[PDB]
Write a protein that binds this ligand. Structure first.
Ligand SMILES: CCCCCCCCCCCCCCCCCC(=O)O
Length: 133
């Protein structure tokens, strides 16, 4: 399936990202900057290997992974986590685990937009991405 996620996406809406970052322990100065950053997400495939790049003026990240295979990940906020990405009900589900905690990053296509839902603790953030030509 994964093919419909592929491409370049830009952030157009964000709800409750501050709650989500607060929940992760992200300091206030970083949250400041993050609240005003509009990342670009690039999803590419080479065979069974996906690469997910997130680019912004603030921080950049890149991960490559095979679906269903665990990998080490250092997140934007400097967490060292164990991650797995799978396709579930047509959604791309990214689970990060560290120190007994979990957060999920779920990507779904709705109406041609990429909706990223981030959950940690009680905090739920929805970020909407639109496809760039
Ligand atoms: C690398 C660009 C990520 C967004 C800007 C900085 C955020 C800094 C700390 C919070 C990071 C929490 C985990 C990643 C959130 C991903 C959000 C997204 O892809 O839209």
């Amino acid at each position: 399936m994964v093919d419909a996620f592929l491409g370049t996406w830009k952030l157009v809406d964000s709800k409750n990202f501050d709650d989500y970052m607060k929940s992760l322990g992200v300091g206030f100065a970083t949250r400041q900057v993050a609240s005003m950053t509009k990342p670009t997400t690039i999803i590419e495939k080479n065979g069974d290997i996906l690469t997910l790049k997130t680019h912004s003026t603030f921080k950049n990240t890149e991960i490559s992974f095979k679906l269903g295979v665990e990998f080490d990940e250092t997140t934007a906020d400097d967490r060292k986590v164990k991650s797995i990405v799978t396709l579930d009900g047509g959604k791309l589900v990214h689970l990060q685990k560290w120190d007994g905690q979990e957060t999920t990053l779920v990507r779904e296509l709705i109406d041609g937009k990429l909706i990223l839902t981030l959950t940690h603790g009680t905090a739920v953030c929805t970020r909407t991405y639109e496809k760039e030509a």
